[PDB]
Amino acid sequence: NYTTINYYKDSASNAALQLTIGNSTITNSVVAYGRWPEFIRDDDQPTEPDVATCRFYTLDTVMWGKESKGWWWKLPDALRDMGLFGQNMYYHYLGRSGYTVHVQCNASKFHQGALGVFAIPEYCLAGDSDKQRYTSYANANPGEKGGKFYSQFNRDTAVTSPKREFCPVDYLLGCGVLLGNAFVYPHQIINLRTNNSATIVLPYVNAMAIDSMVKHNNWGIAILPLSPLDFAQESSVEIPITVTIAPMCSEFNGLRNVTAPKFQ
Amino acid sequence: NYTTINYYKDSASNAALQLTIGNSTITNSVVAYGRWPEFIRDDDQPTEPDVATCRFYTLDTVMWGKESKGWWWKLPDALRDMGLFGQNMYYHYLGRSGYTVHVQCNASKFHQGALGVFAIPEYCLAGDSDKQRYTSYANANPGEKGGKFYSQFNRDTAVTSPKREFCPVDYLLGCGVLLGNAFVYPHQIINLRTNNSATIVLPYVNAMAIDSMVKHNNWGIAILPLSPLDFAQESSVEIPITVTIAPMCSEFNGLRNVTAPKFQ
Amino acid sequence: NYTTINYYKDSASNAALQLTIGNSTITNSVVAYGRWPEFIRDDDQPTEPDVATCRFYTLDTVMWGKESKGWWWKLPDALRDMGLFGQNMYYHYLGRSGYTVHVQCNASKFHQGALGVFAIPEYCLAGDSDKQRYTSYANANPGEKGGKFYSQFNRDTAVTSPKREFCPVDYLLGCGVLLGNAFVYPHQIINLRTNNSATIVLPYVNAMAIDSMVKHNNWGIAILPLSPLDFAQESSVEIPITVTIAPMCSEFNGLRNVTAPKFQ
Amino acid sequence: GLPVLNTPGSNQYLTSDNYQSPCAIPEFDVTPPIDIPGEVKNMMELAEIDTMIPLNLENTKRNTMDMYRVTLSDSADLSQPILCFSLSPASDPRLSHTMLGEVLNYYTHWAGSLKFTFLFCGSMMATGKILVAYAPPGAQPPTSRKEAMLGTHVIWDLGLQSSCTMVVPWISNVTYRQTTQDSFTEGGYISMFYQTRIVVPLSTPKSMSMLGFVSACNDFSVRLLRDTTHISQSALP
Amino acid sequence: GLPVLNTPGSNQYLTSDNYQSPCAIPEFDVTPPIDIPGEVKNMMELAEIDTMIPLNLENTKRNTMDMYRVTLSDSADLSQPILCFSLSPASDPRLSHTMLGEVLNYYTHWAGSLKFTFLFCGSMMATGKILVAYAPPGAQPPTSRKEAMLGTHVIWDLGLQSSCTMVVPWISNVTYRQTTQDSFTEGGYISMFYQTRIVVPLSTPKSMSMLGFVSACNDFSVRLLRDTTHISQSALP
Amino acid sequence: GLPVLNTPGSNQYLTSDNYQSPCAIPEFDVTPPIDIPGEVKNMMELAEIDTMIPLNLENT
Amino acid sequence: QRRSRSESTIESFFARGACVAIIEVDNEEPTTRAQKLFAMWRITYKDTVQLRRKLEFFTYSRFDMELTFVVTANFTNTNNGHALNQVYQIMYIPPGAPTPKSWDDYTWQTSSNPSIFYTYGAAPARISVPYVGLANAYSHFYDGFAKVPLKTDANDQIGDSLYSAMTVDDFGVLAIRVVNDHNPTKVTSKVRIYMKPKHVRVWCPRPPRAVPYYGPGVDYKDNLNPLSEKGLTTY
Amino acid sequence: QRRSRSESTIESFFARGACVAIIEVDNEEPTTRAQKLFAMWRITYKDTVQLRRKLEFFTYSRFDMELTFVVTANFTNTNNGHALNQVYQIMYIPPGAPTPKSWDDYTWQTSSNPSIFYTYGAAPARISVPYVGLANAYSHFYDGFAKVPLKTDANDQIGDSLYSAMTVDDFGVLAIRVVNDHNPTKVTSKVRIYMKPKHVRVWCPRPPRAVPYYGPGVDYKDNLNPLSEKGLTTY
């Protein structure tokens, strides 16, 4: 074989069913990257509410019709005002947690339509102005209500009082990539002719073992209608969509006074 | 001895009688390159008509006189309309086969003359115009009839309606090489004073294990009079020449609808 | 591991309580660099007065008030006129010795203040003129009396008869470095609410095993008030500070006639 | 010192070379890594993931969500194909911008089998049968079910199964195919036809949508890395 | 002779390289060393030594001895903090010029815990209690004792002990923090408050001074050597 | 051939260096030495020999 | 044998040098008006688009770096004389270190900062750098801010920060100058920097960019119609 | 793993080249008036401030040295012609050795003094030096004198000496010349010297300099207010 000896001392120089959680119960699931949520490994005492925070919280129901273009949420932003989980978030400097997301949508055998649910790590969205990275904290953290997609890019032509809001586009996924490839991310498809619910399990993903839960969002959830809703020969159709999220294996550290962000 | 060590990881960087086949019988032979036809080795299920295609087919007889300059055929082009072999050719995308060629020419003890039969792999012929590689598919695939050689280069001086035909030259072998060296190829000599027939066995030769039989011809057969025909003190002499070809170890793959080339 | 062979023959080319001493007794201590004074190792017969020179000598008492800015002494300069130690210094060319320094300052429970005592090796002070390194020998060796610090730099604007004196600054430690970092040197803190005395043990420190005691001072002692003196609601307060120094493990060599420096 | 002779190629910079160079920050304490989910070892792993195909690239539907949907109806012409395209994973516009196509556009040669999936998004009350056919190259592209059924084909029942999968195997004369358009290395054709028609009862929608996905198999390989044409630049920041 | 090929980087001078060079004074008899007290093996050893903090950097007290003293009194507003600063060992003006800060200014990345010490220089007849608090980053800087006591804190009794020590542990999202000001790697806040007030009897001073010191612990590390901004030059001698 | 990288100091002439150089007269038959009295191994040996001191350096 | 996937590995996928910076430096007589006697470049991989697009296939990465420098010089006028061979100095300034204000200030002493001296006409310069990430891996995408506004803040600018940004100054800068004095004739020069990742690990694959980049972020402004026209039933 | 202190060692702290000398040498026709045909530089590390400040963290030191030389040349006029490549001679003159008085005197024979001949356009010159201290370690600070005045001295100048100085001449000097004769056109050149300590040992740590240096000593003249303003109760 060919001979090789490394000269320098540095390595760089070298040549190259029912699910019950806590006091909540909901009656196949998808695990992101095949990794179940877990606590920090062996390699300041953390606080861990075993059941006061690891349970299912239900968000506000939304309506799906013939003109809906999609919805998106950010985690852990969406759960900032849910029981003691939010209190622990705002009373500590460092936090960590995984999630279990459950999407519910029921219809009849005479309806038709398909929804795509995508879980995206580090889901960064585009703005609505010539200025770059000018979106504000308040607009980037809607909370429980979340946001919506659009079919076109509407530039905010107002220099007097810029809105500083996102302008996602459905077929660009709001980030400049084609929607067809979004299936690279963890995903589920709800087809009304086969099923009525979707489930995803998300572990903690980040470049650090633990990070602030207030200034950084680890996950994004996007729901988009792949096929339009229809029902018999009716002009208008509307059905509800519900989202339920459960924290799992949550840890907090850095206890001090409480944080009170200015949301408008 | 001298010392040498290879440094780079890449190898390129390193310093440098009766013969019966199927339902046919014909009453010494030459094997090209000393390799008998064989099926593909171990290294989509192929179709293989054992006897419906591996048999002797006889082409149209030609006449040899005192002014004949030669004849040429292309394989597998010449057998495109022979029984089920052609049907398999045009019903499949990939084909493979070897051949057995038998040339027959009989005369009397008072005749004299010599024929040279040459089997050429990748037999590419020259055109008849200033434009390069402008010959058409129809003219390059004559079929059973085949083509003929010429004693001089006749340029096609017609830009209105170019013929787009080959212009082979006998002493240049139709490809820009001297005829005397054509014996480098597999060959036979029919001398009327010793024998009356020739036989050659051709294996499958190509850069690929299997290839299309419609857009590529693997073999060419060339017959040329090395010595002119003569008989007693007669002004005109004509005798027949016959060619019989048998496919051997033929395989086909890629079954779909039938292909119908436009031959004029 | 990586391979390395040194080619050149030269290494440089290679790639990279009561304490009693003698007839003196004084009724926790700090050892500089954790090294006790010792005699020269095995690696001209030296003279060594075991007890005629290794004993406590007391200097002149100073007064600490509300405007005092600090005091400094140089060793072995301060002991040049103390018994037989000075005689041995001036009768020999080479000398060596360590020291034990004891600082005494007593007050009442109703006083407050803090003193910092620092032992500095090679304590070089700044001048008082534009000319550089122009200080004279007489001014740089005050002796028992020592010198004082100042709160500002007073340039000596007199070219007719330059004074050639030091101009130390309290917050610059007299050498261009911040006082807060002076704790890098061996140090003690006398806080009137906890203690009333300080003790330091200094070994012999120099680039040579033995050196002249007349033209080179090995140690400097600096005392500075970290907190101002105060007493009840009185306008003026003064208390005494005393310094006692004991040579330890002293050696001399190079006996000849006596040296008589011109101190003014 | 040691005699040496300089050979051709000295003092040149080849961007694909692999040599050792000095480190400008010696004795650096590198931060240790952690186990982060989602590690990737090979780019082919990305090409094995199914992604939607923009089948409908009509003028008014391209660059829009509807380009991912193919319409099906109970009153369609049963004698005409539903969709047709060519087996050019990197050059065909309908396959070039998929994840498989994006990965292939960084390479010059490709080989292996492919997997196509079709999803039916109608009502549970709809029924029908479809024929999905692949034809190797060499002959006329199929224009009718009679021609298509002579090649490789699969029959799909909508009622029993809402999704269908067809594997296109590797059948070629050369060992590797080019990622650019070339007749000497053409791959074949893919077509779809109605076996039976779509039947729905009353009070049910008569029109529905179908989706398509493509992916690679474990016997897929690429060769000769090269730059892509999907990104450009006109000015430097 | 031996064939050789010159690679990129030949005949360049990298100031951080480590090669061999000929010696201009061969056969030199070097003077042997001796055992001198005070040998240093690592620069971190200097950062573990406590040094005074110039807490009071007011306009009329900066660059003066009084900048090292913090005033305490028996008539002070008990509802207001005594001192407050940020945990920026290298960029905060009150910590930058300390020995720890001077060492850190030669490096780009730092990590580890810190030790703060406070010394009380009043009379033996004075008594009182103090609260010293550290708050991790993320929330509003504390402005009252109620907010401060929710974070890490220590209660110090002046009468029993004249000195107090508080250890600020390493709590961060990143493995290393920058030595420059940056919100993404902020460290937290340090504050002090009166738990009780300072009580003195008659014939005793009512005002006193307090001193502060900072040092590093054995779990401290630095990375990526760089030049400092504390020394400059305008002309060559 | 063998990859190499040129380091600083290449193609310089240091008068105190110690390298190998080719010989311009190969296969030369050197005359053998003999035992000559007075061989010197070190310069210090010359400094150990006593010599007169010009003590009186007056003008005349 | 059977076909292999040797060249589709991450290491093979990133085993090429890519340009990231073109920097202009001039040598001429200093004057009152603005000049390019020394240049300062902020380190980043987003100036170009090829390596950026290749890297953005994944969310997290961890690698070492190899940097190569190619220098090309030329004249500007032809009636001023000629020049001798020039020497270029390249200095790395990490965050917090002092920055030059002139081509001959004290900062060039490079007592602690690493520096390279390059002689024109020699082989292109080259160095290697280890992984210098504060966290356990590099983050190509960061959904968050560096500050959080608070209700108790005096004004709204206290907590304002750019979206999807970690630090104002990251990885420092490079300062390039010509050490030689000025000849009577002006001489211009360009330095091209080529970067090659080594020992690469990646996490969380991501779909590639489909529309032209617009700034360091994910924003898009123009050319939002990438796909072309084709027939539904057309081969 | 756990964090290491590999890069905070003394050897790593001093493992960089630092400039200590910039020397000008000219080649032109000799004339009656003063010229720079040859330059003499006194060896020291106090000309600059970075390496000096780094070294003054300690009282005593012991190390070997690595020296590198970078040469840059240029023209001055454009109506006199051109020049051929020049050769530079650098000679080390220890104390007591004869010093040159002209660019072509006998002293350049360098029969015993080491010398370097450098050809312009080649790699920067480099050499190494061992520890050459008379004592057991180098003394960065020396509190004393070299002479002691005596009462019996005839005058006060017999015993006068500079404070904090050991020897008038220490470590010798370096003499640099251009060996080539003079072309019709003048050519200027600058030699930059970079110094790297190796095999370093230190003793008696010392607080660093806080105010600008003023001369070889510890004297201070101006800018005695380094610290800035800040609030006592301001974060």
Ligand SMILES: Cc1cc(CCCOc2c(C)cc(-c3noc(C(F)(F)F)n3)cc2C)on1
């Ligand atoms: C992700 C990612 C990684 C990077 C670049 C990190 C490396 O940054 C550098 C560079 C480009 C050069 C040097 C450098 N070290 O030395 C030199 C010099 F000597 F050439 F000046 N340059 C040091 C770092 C940390 O940017 N984004």
Ligand SMILES: Cc1cc(CCCOc2c(C)cc(-c3noc(C(F)(F)F)n3)cc2C)on1
């Ligand atoms: C402390 C301290 C250490 C020093 C410098 C000591 C080394 O001094 C030198 C230098 C700088 C160069 C040479 C030298 N030897 O050879 C050459 C030449 F060949 F380049 F001329 N230069 C010799 C000594 C002793 O200065 N202060």
Ligand SMILES: N[C@@H](CCC(=O)N[C@@H](CS)C(=O)NCC(=O)O)C(=O)O
């Ligand atoms: N032609 C323009 C653009 C030059 C330029 O910098 N082009 C960029 C891309 S927009 C580039 O990378 N060019 C190739 C190179 O010079 O390395 C100019 O000269 O200013």
Ligand SMILES: N[C@@H](CCC(=O)N[C@@H](CS)C(=O)NCC(=O)O)C(=O)O
């Ligand atoms: N600009 C002035 C100062 C030049 C100079 O020598 N500067 C010193 C610091 S005051 C230096 O080290 N410059 C960087 C270098 O040239 O190496 C001049 O050209 O005379």
